[PDB]
């Protein structure tokens, strides 16, 4: 099914919820802008292919509150996307396609 993850929290904390999402194999996923920007989204091939996690990865950023991203969960694997600017602070997410 369609999944939704926010690059933060509706309060004032940089977190990734749901930290883990499970959808079908072929569906997509939409993200949402939050606080503690910018909030990048890079899917480091962690169990899945590169090129795959590539299109799934987002080497961009987030500044405007309203912009969202999309990711194809076709290939069944495990994609791990974390904060580029905070790739070593305590902000990461896990994906699971079935
Ligand atoms: Cu962040």
Swiss-Prot record:
Top-level taxonomic group: Bacteria
Sequence positions that bind Cu cation: 39, 83, 86, 91
Transmembrane residue ranges: none
Domain Plastocyanin-like: 1-98
Induction, as annotated: By copper.
Compartments, record wording: Cellular thylakoid membrane
Molecular-function GO term, any one: electron transfer activity
GO cellular component: plasma membrane-derived thylakoid membrane
Protein keywords: Copper, Electron transport, Membrane, Metal-binding, Signal, Thylakoid, Transport
Cofactors: Cu(2+)
Topology in membrane: Peripheral membrane protein
Protein family according to the UniProt entry: Belongs to the plastocyanin family.
Role, per record: Participates in electron transfer between P700 and the cytochrome b6-f complex in photosystem I.
Name assigned to this protein: Plastocyanin
């Amino acid at each position: 099914a369609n999944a939704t993850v926010k690059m933060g929290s509706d309060s004032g904390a940089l977190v990734f919820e749901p930290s883990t999402v499970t959808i079908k194999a072929g569906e997509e996923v939409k993200w949402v802008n939050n606080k503690l920007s910018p909030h990048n989204i890079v899917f480091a091939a962690d169990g899945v292919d590169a090129d795959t996690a590539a299109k799934l990865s987002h080497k961009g950023l987030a500044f405007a509150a309203g912009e969202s991203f999309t990711s194809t969960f076709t290939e069944p694997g495990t994609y791990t996307y974390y904060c580029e600017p905070h790739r070593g602070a305590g902000m990461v997410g896990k994906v699971v396609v079935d």
